[PDB]
């Protein structure tokens, strides 16, 4: 909840098909920056290429929705 603003307990209990995280207020901005911080780094030709997880998150993004087929 503090880092990414979702409840793993809630996800396990209910198994929602979709889950929307909202970035309003100071806590929302902190969660948004946490979402933007994480990056998958790869080594190609001895170069540290960065691939940003959550393409659809930026300074102007107000929410992010996790998409799933069944749950």
């Amino acid at each position: 909840k503090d880092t990414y603003g979702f409840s793993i307990l809630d996800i396990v209990i209910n198994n929602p098909v979709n889950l929307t995280i909202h970035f309003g207020g100071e806590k929302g901005k902190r969660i948004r920056e946490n979402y933007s911080a994480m990056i998958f780094e790869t080594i190609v030709d001895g170069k540290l290429k960065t691939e940003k997880i959550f393409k659809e998150i930026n300074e102007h993004s107000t929410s992010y929705t996790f998409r799933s087929e069944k749950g």
């Binding site: 603003g5 909202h22 970035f23 207020g25």
Partner: protein
């Protein structure tokens, strides 16, 4: 409300006051209660 001065404040004025202040405050309180019950802290509603 037209032509309702201090001496004329009556049922209609009290009802209008309810609509325009008290039930507005109740409506924001209801939205607050729903958001808190659903554990929403990061999606505030903008009361204009």
């Amino acid at each position: 409300e037209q032509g309702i001065e201090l001496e004329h404040i009556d049922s209609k004025s009290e009802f209008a006051h309810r609509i325009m202040l008290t039930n507005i405050l109740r409506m924001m309180g209801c939205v607050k209660k729903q958001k808190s019950a659903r554990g929403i802290e990061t999606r505030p509603a903008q009361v204009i």
